[PDB]
Structure formats: structure tokens, C-alpha cells
Design a protein around this ligand. Sequence first.
Ligand SMILES: [Mg+2]
Lengths: 687, 55
Amino acid sequence: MVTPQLEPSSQGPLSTLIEQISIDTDWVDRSFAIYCVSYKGIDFSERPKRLVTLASETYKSGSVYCLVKGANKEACYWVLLPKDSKLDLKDTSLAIKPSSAAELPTWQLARLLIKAIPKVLSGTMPEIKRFESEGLYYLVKSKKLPKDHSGYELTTVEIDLAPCAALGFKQTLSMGTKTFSPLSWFTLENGEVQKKARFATRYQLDDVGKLVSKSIKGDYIKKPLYSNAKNRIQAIDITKESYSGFQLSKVGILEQFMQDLKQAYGDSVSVKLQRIPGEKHRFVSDTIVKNHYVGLFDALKEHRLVICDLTENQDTDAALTLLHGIEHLDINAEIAEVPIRGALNILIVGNKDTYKSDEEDPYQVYRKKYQDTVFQSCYPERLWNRQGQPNRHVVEVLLKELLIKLEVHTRKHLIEYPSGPERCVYYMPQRPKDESSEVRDEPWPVYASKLVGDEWQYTQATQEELEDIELDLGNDKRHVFHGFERSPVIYWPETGDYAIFIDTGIQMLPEFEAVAERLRELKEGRSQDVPIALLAQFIEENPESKVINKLRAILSEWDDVAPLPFDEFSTIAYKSSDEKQFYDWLREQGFFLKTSIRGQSEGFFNASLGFFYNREQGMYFAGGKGSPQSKIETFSHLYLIKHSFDALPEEVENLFDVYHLRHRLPTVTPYPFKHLREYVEMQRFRS
Amino acid sequence: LTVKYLNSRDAFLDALLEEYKPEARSSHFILNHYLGIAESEQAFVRSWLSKLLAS
DNA sequence: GTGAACCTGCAGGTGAGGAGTCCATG
DNA sequence: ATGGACTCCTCACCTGCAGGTTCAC
DNA sequence: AGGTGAGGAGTC
Ligand SMILES: [Mg+2]
């Protein structure tokens, strides 16, 4: 099989994939105790109740800091106890066997040293029962409950380890938001706890380290307030160059985690991350996208566009608003009371669930009858924003999608796409829309597209082609012809080659140590008040500088003896040529106030921009455009390409160069896989 | 008669909040947790409190 | 000689953001 | 009374102006 | 029945 033979790395983007874990086995074996509770070879068909009781009874007795579960086909479970400890269990259905701390896989042991010994890093053994569920939960936010209750809802960030199946079971970190709610909110007034909260693990807050931990006594359970909902914490934040706001993100807690493994273990255990090699990185500007979209709209100009309304209880000027939005782009449309045949149509419909089952849905009816016409639809609520103003973005999206279907219908491209590998056929599996299609292995139809001359040909793949593909796939046929999630494939008939693109799981991280050091220096600098004499000296020494006019103003409104604080310099920016010298001159004397952190020469914020491609390993990722902002809310992912090639063809690189699949952002999906996916949608109404 | 106009100062309040609860970590956390204002009502609060204490 | 493109990287974001009191009526 | 694994759900994005360089005629 | 991605809740 193929192994993840990466490189030791010297430079490049930083990854959440752990490179090496170092643990001193002597310091762990001589300081703790590991046992083994074997339930193998008893009965594999009577697992449920016996496993339940196994876990519960193993928790029942013994001073146990933590316990992890071993592999399903491996030795026992794994437990951690302090020195001179006992795992005495009365029942002998399972056998105990003391072992050492050098006989376990590294990640399992490191998980144990991450959970319970960092939570006890102040106090231990004060009571009978103690345990930590999983990970560490730091605190970032609290919210007050409605007036009828008491307490707060808490927001936490979780750090833990997990495997990565795509890269040979290599270890990855994780960071996730979890929410805690008080107990009384789920308990009825009659003392009857609701069914969900009757059996729930309880937790307790702390006032020193801001860590939520396990305890039998406590007024918190792990569940949100109302129902299925989401809470999230931003990735990074450098607003106004503050070091307090940088400490409350998902990369600020990660900096604290590395400072807590040092103050409890010293240098015995350390975690080192991996840098993916990279030499080809293409930043995308803003002008290129703009010029692309202009030519996008020009082609749509020379056609006919009709808007129709089919709501029952007609209300709102949705047609007028949409037409205004369209006409602001020099595209002229019209309003019709019934859809016209042979012209592009945008229809306004209602909620799909409302209409009865045998009711003849306007959309379905007016589709099935007119079978040579392109269609679009929208709900009337999406054209107005939160504050009532019209939403432009929706209008642009609708127009672009219309053009895509028109391109499919006419079988000839209208705008200049790049070129791709030739003599290849595109296959896409398609899940049945029947609700009975919960069968995992049930065969699916597969649709095929190809290019001959200048015309695309679309047809449903025959049985023979499907037999041909699976033979050459090999061990990779499971991703194409098996499972609840089936991925498309490009196939070469002459040589028997395939292309599959797989999401892996790594989130790209930017630099966070180098940013933190700078922010701390700025915080220390912005504490003192600058003396008046220094400013007078600067005025005398540089008569020609233009900044003087600003300075003289401030000094004229202030006391002649009291020192000047930082907030009086807000009117001068760090932008012009004569404005940089002033701040640098103050820096030489010990006053550091402003600096540059988002320059492209610095290279800190490069993991969230541009398009990145590595050919020999087949790794790529895409991010934003322009310049970094103060607030970023998502981490980019990492993808891998699986091939049977001796050397991957140089023509694949061109399929990721289209700027109208992610609406002004680079994409991570080939363009020929979009058109075909719009042909498997207008084929569910033909018959 | 002496007259003085007071602007907003954030570094003035930052240190004071830290001294009020010396065992915490940041300033926004102290303001949100021990005091009772959420993230929406933070800029306006900072604004008046700074001037009041400065006077 | 000049004025149109052309090319970085620093700021700033919906509105604005509360007490106190007189008199007649079934 | 317990742990870690698939499947379905909801939520956010889709900048902007100012100052220094440069051709293109 | 805007879209593509990145990601938090509820159970065998
Ligand atoms: Mg569609």
C-alpha cells in the first residue's frame, strides 16, 4: 500500500498535522500506573449489555484519573492511575494485567497525558470519585438567561487529538465550540426532570483557570438552550492591534495550550507541527475578477429575459424589485403574467412544503408541459435584507446560473474557458431521489459526458462502460461504486487511468507566535504618556515636515505641563511618507505606538489567500482574494488527488482557473463537473 | 473658572479593570463576565466610563 | 508633458442607545 | 451508567479609499 | 425551490 512519505520540511504553510510526538517513557512509567481490563474472547454476540456494565463498573471504583479505549481488536482498555494504586474489581469476568508505559502506541498515551493530569494541575485526590470526560474546555463567553431563571450559558473551545484516515492514520489536532446550559432550564417545576436530562453527565465551572470540568456536583449539563442550533467562535482577530482580542479566538487558545504543557511537564513532552512544501503559489487580484464578470454579463445581454409571478395570495413588488436589480446592469427584461415558451424564465414561487401532495405545484406543472425552455425560481423573501434594503448579491447569482444552464442547453461554450486533458470521459454517479433509497450498496445510475469536435455529448452510461471502469479502479472502486457518498471520476479509455479528488481534513494555520510577540510589544508601548519636550524637539529639528501642522493643533488644546496620552494622536495615520518618520523617531526614544503587520513582504497572512498547488504530491488549496481583513471566520481545507499515473498530466492544472463557481473566489472543484451536474436535474422531469 | 474637555481613553480603563480582578486573563472577559454587559453593548459603555473616572 | 490605468496595504463597520408627573373617571 | 464513529442540519460571504509609480500618446 | 464550502448537534 501507499504510505504518507512526507518531508522533514523547512518552510511553507503551517498545518494542524502533528509531525512528531516526544514523550519520556522513563518519566511516565516511574510516575504513573497502567493496567489492562480484557474482555476479549468472552462473547462477541453478547457485547451490548456486558460492554455497558464493563464501562460503568470500571468507573465505579478505584482512584482513576482517566481511561481511554484501545482498538476494537487489541488489548483490553487502557487506564491511568497514580503511583501505588489499585484496580481491585470483585467480578472476574475480565482479567487485569499490570503493564508498563512503553508498551502502548504514542498517540493513545499522549491522549491520556492530555486529559486528566492537565485538569488536576492544581489539586488532586480531595475526594472519592474524579474523572475528566475528554479534552480541555477554556472559557470565552457567557450569556445571561431570560428573567425567569438564573445562571449563565457558557461557550467553550475544545482541544483533542484524532486520527486522519487519508494520510495513513497520522495524528491531527482539533478545535471545536461547545456550549453549556444550566440544569434547572430542562427540569419541570414539579421536580420531574425531562427525559433527555434524566441521565446526563454533569459539569462544573472554575474561577481560577477558567476551565469547565467534570464533577458529580454542579449545575451544568452539555446541551444548548432551545433546540438544534449553532454557536461559533471566530478564527483570528487583530482589530485595532489589541492583545486582549487576540486571546479570545481559536488560535489564541492554541497558544495557551502550548504554555500549559510546559508548566506541568517541563520539556518532557512537546508537540511539533508539519509544514507542507510549496513552490507554486498564485495570488489573485481584484481587477481580474471584475473584468471576468463584465464579459460574463455581455453574453447574457443579447437574449430575452422574462419574470413571472405564481403566488396564490399575491403581495409585495417582487417582480418590480427584481427587474430594478437586473436593469441596473444594462440587462433589459420584462414582466409576463404567464411564462413564455422559448425564452429564459425566472419564476417567483412559494414554499414547497405548503402545497399539498396532489396539488399541482406551479413549478412542476409549468415545467413538465414546456420541455424546451430554461427555468429558474426563487422565493419572494430572499430579495430583502435584514434592514429592508434590496439584496444585490442574489441578483448576480441568479443571472450567472441562468447563463450556465443556457450553455448546457446549446451544447456549445459561450465564454472563453481554458483547455483541459483530452480523450477523457466524465462519469458522475447519481443518488436516487426516492425516499426508499436508504440501501447502502444499491446500484446507482451513472451519467457520462464528453467532447467531440466543438460539441459536448451528454448520455447515460451503458452497462458495458460501467463494467470497464470498475476493473481498472482497483482498491479505489470503493469511493466510486460504494457507500452513501459517491464521488465522480474522469476516466481514460485508452490507458485505463482515473482521477479522484478527496477532502482530507487538515485546516491551514497562519503564523501566531510572531504576531503575538509584536502585539505584546505594542501593548507595553501604549501605556505611558509622551512628554511635551520631546514633541517640541521634533518640531524644531524638522521644519519642512508637513505633520507639524497637526501637532501644533493638539498642543494648543492641552495643558502646557501635563504629558500627552496616546489617544490625542488618533488624527494622524501611519500611511504617508512624512507620517512614518515621526513614529519611527519616537520608537528610537522608547515610544513604540504603530507598526505594519499585514504587508505581503511579511508573509504572516499567506495561508488564507490565493491558490496553492503542489504537482509532485498533488496537494492544493484555495482561499480569499485581495488583502487580509481584521476578522476571518473560516479555515481553509486540504485536498488530495488520487491517480494511477506515472506522472500527472500538465493539463489538469487549468480546470481550477474559473472565477464564477464560487462567486468571486477561487474554487476547489473542476468546471466540467458542474455542467454535468445540471444535466442530472432537468432529466428527473422528462419521464 | 477652569474648563477642560475630556476625550475617550481606553488604556486608562484597561489597567484599572486588570487591577480590579488580578487573577483573570484579559479585559473584555472581565467586563463581560464579572460586570453585566454583552458584546453588543461594549463600545458605548467604554466610552462613558472612561470620561467619568478621568474626571 | 500629462493624464488614463495600474498596484499595495491601513481603516472602519444601521440607525442611536431615559427619567418623572396631574387629574378625572364606579 | 459509557466512547467514538457515519449521516443530516444551520450559517456566513459576496471591502473601500488614499498615496506613490507609470506608461501611452 | 440562489450557490459553494466549512462546520456544530442529535444517535446506532
Ligand atoms: Mg439549481
